[PDB]
Amino acid sequence: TRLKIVTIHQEPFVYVKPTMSDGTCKEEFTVNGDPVKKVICTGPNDTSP
Amino acid sequence: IIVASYTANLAAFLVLDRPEERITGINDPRLRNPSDKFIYATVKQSSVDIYFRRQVELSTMYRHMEKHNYESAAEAIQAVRDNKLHAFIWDSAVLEFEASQKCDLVTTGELFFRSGFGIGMRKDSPWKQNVSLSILKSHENGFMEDLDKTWVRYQELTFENMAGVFMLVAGGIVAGIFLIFIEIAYK
Amino acid sequence: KSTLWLLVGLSVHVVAVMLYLLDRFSPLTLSSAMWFSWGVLLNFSARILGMVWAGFAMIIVASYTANLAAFLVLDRPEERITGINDPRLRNPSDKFIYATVKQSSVDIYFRRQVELSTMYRHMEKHNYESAAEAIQAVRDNKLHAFIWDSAVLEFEASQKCDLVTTGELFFRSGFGIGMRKDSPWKQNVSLSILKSHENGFMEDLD
Amino acid sequence: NKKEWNGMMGELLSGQADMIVAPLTINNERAQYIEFSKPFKYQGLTILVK
Amino acid sequence: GSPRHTVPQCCYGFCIDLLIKLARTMNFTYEVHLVADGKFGTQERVNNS
Amino acid sequence: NGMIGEVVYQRAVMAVGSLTINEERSEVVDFSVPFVETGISVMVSASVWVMMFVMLLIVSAIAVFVFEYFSFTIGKAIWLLWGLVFNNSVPVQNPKGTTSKIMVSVWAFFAVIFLASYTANLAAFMIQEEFVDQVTGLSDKKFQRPHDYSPPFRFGTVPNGSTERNIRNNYPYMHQYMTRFNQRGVEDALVSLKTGKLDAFIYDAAVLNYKAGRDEGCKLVTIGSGYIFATTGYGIALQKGSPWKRQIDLALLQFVGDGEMEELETLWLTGICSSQLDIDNMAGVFYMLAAAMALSLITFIW
Amino acid sequence: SFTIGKAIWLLWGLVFNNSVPVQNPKGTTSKIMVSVWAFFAVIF
Amino acid sequence: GRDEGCKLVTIGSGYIFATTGYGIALQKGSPWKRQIDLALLQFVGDGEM
Ligand SMILES: *[C@@H]1O[C@H](CO)[C@@H](O[C@@H]2O[C@H](CO)[C@@H](O)[C@H](O)[C@H]2NC(C)=O)[C@H](O)[C@H]1NC(C)=O
Ligand SMILES: *[C@@H]1O[C@H](CO)[C@@H](O)[C@H](O)[C@H]1NC(C)=O
Ligand SMILES: *[C@@H]1O[C@H](CO)[C@@H](O)[C@H](O)[C@H]1NC(C)=O
Numbered sequence: 001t002r003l004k005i006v007t008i009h010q011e012p013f014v015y016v017k018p019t020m021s022d023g024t025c026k027e028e029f030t031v032n033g034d035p036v037k038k039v040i041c042t043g044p045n046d047t048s049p
Numbered sequence: 050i051i052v053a054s055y056t057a058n059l060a061a062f063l064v065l066d067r068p069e070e071r072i073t074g075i076n077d078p079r080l081r082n083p084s085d086k087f088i089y090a091t092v093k094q095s096s097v098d099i100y101f102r103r104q105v106e107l108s109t110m111y112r113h114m115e116k117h118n119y120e121s122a123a124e125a126i127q128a129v130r131d132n133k134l135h136a137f138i139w140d141s142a143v144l145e146f147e148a149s150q151k152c153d154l155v156t157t158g159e160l161f162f163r164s165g166f167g168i169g170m171r172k173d174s175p176w177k178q179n180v181s182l183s184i185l186k187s188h189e190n191g192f193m194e195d196l197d198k199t200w201v202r203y204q205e206l207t208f209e210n211m212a213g214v215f216m217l218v219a220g221g222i223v224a225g226i227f228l229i230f231i232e233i234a235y236k
Numbered sequence: 237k238s239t240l241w242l243l244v245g246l247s248v249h250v251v252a253v254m255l256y257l258l259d260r261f262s263p264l265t266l267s268s269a270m271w272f273s274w275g276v277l278l279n280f281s282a283r284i285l286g287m288v289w290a291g292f293a294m295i296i297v298a299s300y301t302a303n304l305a306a307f308l309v310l311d312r313p314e315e316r317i318t319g320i321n322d323p324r325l326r327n328p329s330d331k332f333i334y335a336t337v338k339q340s341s342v343d344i345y346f347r348r349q350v351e352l353s354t355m356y357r358h359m360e361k362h363n364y365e366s367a368a369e370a371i372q373a374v375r376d377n378k379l380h381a382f383i384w385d386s387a388v389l390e391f392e393a394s395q396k397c398d399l400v401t402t403g404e405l406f407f408r409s410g411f412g413i414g415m416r417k418d419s420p421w422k423q424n425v426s427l428s429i430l431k432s433h434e435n436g437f438m439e440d441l442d
Numbered sequence: 443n444k445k446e447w448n449g450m451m452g453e454l455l456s457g458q459a460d461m462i463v464a465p466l467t468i469n470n471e472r473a474q475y476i477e478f479s480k481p482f483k484y485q486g487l488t489i490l491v492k
Numbered sequence: 493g494s495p496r497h498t499v500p501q502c503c504y505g506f507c508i509d510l511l512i513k514l515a516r517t518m519n520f521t522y523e524v525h526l527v528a529d530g531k532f533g534t535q536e537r538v539n540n541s
Numbered sequence: 542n543g544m545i546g547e548v549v550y551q552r553a554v555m556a557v558g559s560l561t562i563n564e565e566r567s568e569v570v571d572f573s574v575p576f577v578e579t580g581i582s583v584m585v586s587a588s589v590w591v592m593m594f595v596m597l598l599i600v601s602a603i604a605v606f607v608f609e610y611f612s613f614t615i616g617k618a619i620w621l622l623w624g625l626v627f628n629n630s631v632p633v634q635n636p637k638g639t640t641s642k643i644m645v646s647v648w649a650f651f652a653v654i655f656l657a658s659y660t661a662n663l664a665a666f667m668i669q670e671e672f673v674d675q676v677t678g679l680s681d682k683k684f685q686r687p688h689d690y691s692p693p694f695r696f697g698t699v700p701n702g703s704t705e706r707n708i709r710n711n712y713p714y715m716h717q718y719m720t721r722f723n724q725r726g727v728e729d730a731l732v733s734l735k736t737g738k739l740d741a742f743i744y745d746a747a748v749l750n751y752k753a754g755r756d757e758g759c760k761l762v763t764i765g766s767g768y769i770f771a772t773t774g775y776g777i778a779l780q781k782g783s784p785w786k787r788q789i790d791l792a793l794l795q796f797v798g799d800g801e802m803e804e805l806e807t808l809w810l811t812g813i814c815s816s817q818l819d820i821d822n823m824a825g826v827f828y829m830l831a832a833a834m835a836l837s838l839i840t841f842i843w
Numbered sequence: 844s845f846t847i848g849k850a851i852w853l854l855w856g857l858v859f860n861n862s863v864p865v866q867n868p869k870g871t872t873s874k875i876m877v878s879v880w881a882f883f884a885v886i887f
Numbered sequence: 888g889r890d891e892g893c894k895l896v897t898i899g900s901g902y903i904f905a906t907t908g909y910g911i912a913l914q915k916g917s918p919w920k921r922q923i924d925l926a927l928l929q930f931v932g933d934g935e936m
């Protein structure tokens with residue numbers, strides 16, 4: 001039932017934002033009032049160099 | 050007839066001719082034998098690299114684009130913004146959205162290797178038929194148009210050479226003020 | 237190988253009369269003021285409206301220069317074929333009449349090429365005997381194209397300037413002397429041909 | 443002297459991942475080893491300049 | 493057009509003077525005549541056999 | 542019926558020919574990988590004046606200075622100034638001051654280079670070929686009702702098609718308005734669009750692109766490039782459980798992944814395809830002269 | 844007062860849009876001819 | 888055709904020049920001559936050249 005999902009940091013497709021207070025997101029709207037339902041992902045800051 | 054010839058050669062200078070900043074796609078012979086003036090590469094370890102590696106008529110560019118392989122596409126954006134590049138190979142709609150972001154980033158006219166983005170999947174698995182049926186159900190309704198409304202569809206004077214002439218006209222007026230006061234002192 | 241000017245003329249024939257009425261309403265002379273308006277549109281609020289109309293006259297003559305430049309510089313009549321890669325000849329019609337000499341090398345050369353079978357089926361209803369028949373037919377505009385070698389067509393272009401060739405040069409071939417089988421007149425006759433090649437006798441024949 | 447994979451395919455084939463939901467360029471060689479789904483996005487290649 | 497009219501006329505030009513140069517080079521006499529029809533020649537089926 | 546009736550009932554092996562892909566066709570058989578992008582389509586038939594005003598006031602102030610040194614051309618120098626920009630040769634005033642002659646000569650040199658640059662601007666506007674459209678989407682207000690706009694137009698598809706099923710599963714009222722507007726043949730609809738027995742037509746994308754690439758005159762013009770459309774692909778249909786499917790998919794990926802597919806598309810497509818018009822500019826001319834006579838009627842109160 | 848044949852200096856002088864004063868035209872035939880010639884000079 | 892900016896310009900298109908051709912050098916009396924000649928005539932007269 002739990003599916004491992006992995007992706008690459010695509011610039012117009014995968015937007016990564018730091019946490020606001022503690023493991024949370026900022027619920028913002030689009031230009032048409034649609035709230036962007038974010039997801040809690042886990043990843044590194046940059047590459048190995 | 051002097052000012053008619055001047056109108057004619059200014060129309061020759063700024064209308065008909067053009068500095069060929071464009072490449073006209075992959076079939077540019079000057080990029081078939083590149084140099085240090087034509088700095089162009091792609092993302093390191095991509096499918097486009099293997100696609101150009103299989104084709105034997107794209108080996109020479111494969112000998113060139115291997116010199117400056119970049120990790121991410123944002124590295125290529127920062128390099129071509131800071132004039133470290135001259136051309137970049139990438140897909141269409143991402144560059145269209147970034148052209149909506151930055152107006153200086155302009156694509157070219159040609160379009161080749163019409164490929165497709167999907168979802169990377171495993172071998173024989175129960176997540177094969179139902180997932181593809183869900184994708185086709187997303188294709189058949191207006192959800193793809195809504196996805197285009199999220200990111201794809203949502204986008205974001207004549208002072209060329211005679212502006213300096215206009216500034217020299219203004220400076221000539223300023224100097225002519227003192228020249229006319231000297232002419233007033235003359236008579 | 238106009239009406240908008242009439243509308244502007246009717247407009248200014250209204251404008252000059254109403255500006256003379258404006259000048260009369262604002263405190264020999266009639267025709268003189270009309271002639272002054274004639275000198276206004278062509279080489280005191282009425283003077284202000286007249287100088288605004290003079291600005292309109294400059295933008296009208298600038299638009300006239302601009303659209304005559306559109307009329308003769310950028311546009312080009314589609315009278316060219318640009319060689320074998322023309323979709324007019326890949327998909328012919330009733331007004332696309334192209335042929336060659338009947339029972340020539342063009343027939344076999346387009347009969348081997350199976351993708352050129354459309355021209356093979358088209359020219360077989362139009363093949364003529366001699367090239368002079370082709371010249372006489374294309375002079376009366378019965379033809380539209382003619383697949384032929386370069387030298388004869390360039391010589392007839394020097395004769396008749398309306399005969400214009402195209403840009404592409406395909407199937408670079410060679411013309412020699414028709415010779416028999418094994419014979420002693422094959423070797424040193426060809427050596428004489430090569431001796432004609434090495435000197436300026438080809439230039440003399442040019 | 444053995445050929446392997448890395449990146450998303452390296453994490454997938456090692457069992458560390460189970461479903462690569464990513465806009466990956468679907469090509470010949472990567473489908474020779476694993477099965478792919480039908481693509482959602484369709485676009486070609488082009489050149490970005492300044 | 494022509495029931496029987498085959499006459500000797502005058503011929504000159506490019507290939508004629510080329511053959512005159514060849515006859516100046518190689519030692520031979522000649523017999524210049526013309527082709528009967530107006531065709532090059534194709535490998536076409538004769539109507540019998 | 543058709544190829545689905547031949548393949549599913551095991552009278553045919555596979556559908557090598559072209560076929561639209563939707564839900565129930567993917568339910569009955571298993572399609573291959575796509576090879577061509579074939580969606581659906583609809584075929585149908587502010588700084589110059591400010592600085593010139595500032596320099597106009599500067600020229601008028603210099604003329605006032607010349608008048609203060611040395612007949613009524615205090616504010617009437619503007620009538621000589623902007624009037625002789627346009628070189629229509631209106632008799633205005635003969636100045637005696639050398640200052641005014643030098644200033645008007647510099648202004649006239651600026652006017653000559655300004656008119657030359659304006660002819661260059663008109664040529665640069667004359668370079669471009671503008672593109673106009675009538676319907677800009679599948680959700681058009683024209684598509685709601687043809688009585689809503691002044692021409693009652695007409696739209697058609699091919700009969701018995703999967704596009705009709707997609708419309709009936711997307712917009713049943715569109716099928717209701719299409720029921721009065723049916724037709725039979727693709728080339729019949731082509732002749733109906735050319736002669737004028739049809740206004741717009743709804744079909745797939747690349748087939749109409751091939752028909753427009755071979756058409757005389759290039760009058761029928763597409764709308765967009767698959768942006769407000771279905772944007773699907775074509776593949777090969779095989780029976781469910783066929784062992785040859787993976788090898789056919791690898792063969793298609795080899796045929797696409799070498800540039801040979803682009804050569805085949807180049808072989809089987811065609812990549813082909815005035816007078817005076819200033820009616821918007823002339824309408825602006827008439828509107829500005831109407832505003833000018835309105836301002837004159839305002840100033841007539843004194 | 845001097846427009847016998849001196850109007851050539853107004854004819855070919857006002858072809859070129861020079862804004863230089865030359866002569867005051869008085870004949871109606873002269874003014875109509877100068878208007879037609881001025882349109883001819885603009886198109887020329 | 889590979890010139891940087893088309894700086895060097897040719898003269899003519901073979902008019903007051905030698906106007907010769909290229910061939911395959913074989914030995915005198917070689918049996919492979921006719922086969923290579925017919926192969927070249929096939930390679931030119933099909934659009935492959
Ligand atoms: C030129 O053509 C003639 C006739 O085919 C040949 O000339 C003879 O060549 C042989 C040598 O093979 C000499 O011994 C003879 O003296 C030549 N002439 C005579 C009198 O027969 C040969 O084909 C060519 N020879 C040259 C000079 O190139
Ligand atoms: C997957 O698809 C089949 C066929 O439509 C259906 O019977 C089944 O319930 C679906 N669910 C699964 C197993 O994910
Ligand atoms: C040659 O042929 C033409 C056409 O058949 C004929 O009219 C003419 O009389 C003939 N002339 C001679 C000289 O035989």
Ligand SMILES: *[C@@H]1O[C@H](CO)[C@@H](O)[C@H](O)[C@H]1NC(C)=O
Nearest residue numbers: 514515516517518519520521
């Ligand atoms: C003419 O033929 C004779 C035959 O003996 C030969 O010797 C001579 O070389 C020839 N002359 C020319 C011009 O070839």
Ligand SMILES: *[C@@H]1O[C@H](CO)[C@@H](O)[C@H](O)[C@H]1NC(C)=O
Nearest residue numbers: 338339534536537538539540
């Ligand atoms: C045989 O018939 C064909 C039909 O085209 C014709 O072209 C050919 O001239 C005929 N052969 C002879 C000997 O006339």
Ligand SMILES: *[C@@H]1O[C@H](CO)[C@@H](O)[C@H](O)[C@H]1NC(C)=O
Nearest residue numbers: 542699700701702724725726
């Ligand atoms: C569409 O299908 C119907 C049967 O449902 C048939 O009668 C009709 O002829 C078909 N349309 C065509 C091919 O004109």
